[PDB]
Amino acid sequence: PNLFVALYDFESRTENTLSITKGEKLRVLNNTENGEWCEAQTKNGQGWVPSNYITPVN
Fold it and tell me: Which residues carry this modification: Phosphotyrosine?
């Protein structure tokens, strides 16, 4: 899968993270070696989010 949707709201102010809202669509482009964080892209930009806060649309 390449297209995902946010499962839960996630908000962070740190650099490189991306804020996402439940139901918001996102494309995943990369992840950490530990798999706990995913690099997501939305209409708001690109940044890192918790990998267990998203789920495939497919």
Answer: 8, 53
Give the amino acid at 47.
G
Would you say 27 and 40 are in contact if contact means Cβ atoms under 8 Å apart?
yes
Q: What experiment produced this structure?
A: X-ray
CB 51 within 8 A of CB 37: yes
CA–chain centroid gap for 19, Å, is 8
What pairs with residue 49 in β-bridges?
38
**Taking a C-beta distance cutoff of 8 angstroms, is the pair 8, 54 a contact?**
no
Token pair in block for residue 9: 């709201």
